Amino acid sequence: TKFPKFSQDLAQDPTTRRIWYGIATAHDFETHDGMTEENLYQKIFASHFGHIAIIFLWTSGTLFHVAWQGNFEQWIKDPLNIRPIAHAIWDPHFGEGAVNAFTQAGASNPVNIAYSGVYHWFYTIGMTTNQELYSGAVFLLVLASLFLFAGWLHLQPKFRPSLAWFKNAESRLNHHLAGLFGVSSLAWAGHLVHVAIPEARGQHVGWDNFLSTPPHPAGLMPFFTGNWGVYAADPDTAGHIFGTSEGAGTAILTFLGGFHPQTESLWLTDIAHHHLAIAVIFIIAGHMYRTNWGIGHSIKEILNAHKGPLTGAGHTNLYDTINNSLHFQLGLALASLGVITSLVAQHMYSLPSYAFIAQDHTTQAALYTHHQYIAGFLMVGAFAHGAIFFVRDYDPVANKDNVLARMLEHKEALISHLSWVSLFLGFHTLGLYVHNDVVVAFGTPEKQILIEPVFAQWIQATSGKALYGFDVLLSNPDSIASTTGAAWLPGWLDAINSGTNSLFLTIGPGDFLVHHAIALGLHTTALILIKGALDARGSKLMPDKKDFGYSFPCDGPGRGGTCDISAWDAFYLAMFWMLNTLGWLTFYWHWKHLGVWSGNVAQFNENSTYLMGWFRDYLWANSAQLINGYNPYGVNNLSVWAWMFLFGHLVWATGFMFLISWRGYWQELIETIVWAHERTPLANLVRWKDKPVALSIVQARLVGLAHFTVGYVLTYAAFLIASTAGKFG
């Protein structure tokens, strides 16, 4: 059989497994038949072009559907009272009740309500009309076409890059720092000052008249004469109304700090100076490494020079290890991307940048949950692909006595102390929670163990939170740090001391307990991933694991039993802990913000100290409207979310039987079914081409994990959206 063309051993398989594994190893280019390094790199280049084109097409589709079936031009007239529309509904399976229920947001047909928060983003960046959205969609279509053609071209024989071109770290770093990061940020700052701010102040600026409309009145002379302060004079007053000329200043680069009084979001001019400054810094950074002139650093000598007397060989030979190994680079990139996605979530829920996005609680919750889940997935993938590197691309002799080898030396100490910290957190956190539960249940909630989060409150004070009376640093009015004449200090101190936003929310004993539980989850997931990565090469039970690859089922029932001794199994186990930690995180965030938005912070404050309050006040209480989306009486707009809630519960349940029941049972059952088919008249005329067999052990684990994760995500998303929409939306 032809398929799969990249693996002969799979193509000669006569069973249905050939269909499955061929899918699973399709995009693993290294293990393909007759694969060279150069071909691998070029194929990766083309595939990355493809993913970029897919991203651009997805964004174009978002824009086009919003412009076509949305209410963008009506939404901007009243962002605080109109639900944005995602896309239209066309379902012949609908009934009259569903049609009436889903005709919402002033539409004339069944429509969905957008929760990605793209309306606020488009409004903030200056898009105000449907035709602008349409032009953006068409331009993104053209851009995706260009990138697809670029992939095809650089895949052609005359345009195939050489191996040396791919292994040019210095030139890539210089171009991608100064150009990709710096020039793009500078262009965004120029877009903000030339277009976004004038449109926010009522002046319409487009391609038609942006050449005849200067950003600043006395423009482009002070920048070259050095009198930059002119661009900071006359900022937007506190009475400014977004999108109008009432109370609007003329400054284009400010450091006001805090939030816009009306939109409850960061000042646009602050964003302009911020992106300009980081563009300048990135452009400076991009002139660091030597490419083909005399000046510039070289990464290899920097790495080979930083060696100490305690670590042995230090960072020697690390340049070759990183450059020759693609999995090392992928793991580093995934770790960094996950960290900065977590950063995006944490600094975006507390410092909103888009106008009126702080008042749309549903979109805020959705965005936080989404980007935090993405960050968790990326953080898991970093460790997984690092373990893959250790299995495949790690050379012990080359990286001898350096830090990479030193990691595998005290790996037992690493795992032991990690196990100790995980157990130490878990025991004394579960003990405190159960103690509070038991004490509260016995009718004496006064004997609870409530620890004030003193250190985090001290940090809040050091940033300027004057509620705990710590009187330290920025909270100290006489401290040198608070008497530097910083232009952002008044606005920042005003915003931090206001209780109307999420900027440094007040904390208590429940936040202490839940943050320590999150710490337990993080350390346990790290323990699983790290032990898998370090034991991937081998352990006492399997000294020769590297010979068996990264993912293998087991080594049989002998020598104890094996049963998930591979590093792929470590990743598979760590996915569950990642999901559990993300669940705790999102539960804490959502309940705290429900209390904040309703003004009933005391409910969370006094009910989060014991687990029964979590079970009753959060889960039981907030499901009242969700599960009533469709009743024996009728149907409301939350019907789809109730259906998806049950759907997620069902898929989560279904994953359990790929996770618990194992292969031999189903193999024998399929044997019986095969007998039944072969012995049946009028069905013997039809025969299979691939012999039906049960799913393999690793495939079964993967499928169970997939159903599990899909159910988890769908259930929580449905519950969160339904609860927040019913409460506030």
Binding site: A46, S47, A53, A137, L141, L148, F149, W152
Partner: protein, 31 residues
């Protein structure tokens, strides 16, 4: 103001180009 039917049809026709380019890229990558 809301779009027109001609705009939607033109968007479809424009999107017909990245479809052809993506088909070519997929065939090239399969090779």
């Amino acid at each position: 103001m809301a779009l027109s039917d001609t705009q939607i049809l033109a968007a479809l026709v424009v999107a017909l180009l990245p479809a052809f380019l993506a088909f070519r890229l997929s065939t090239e990558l399969y090779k």
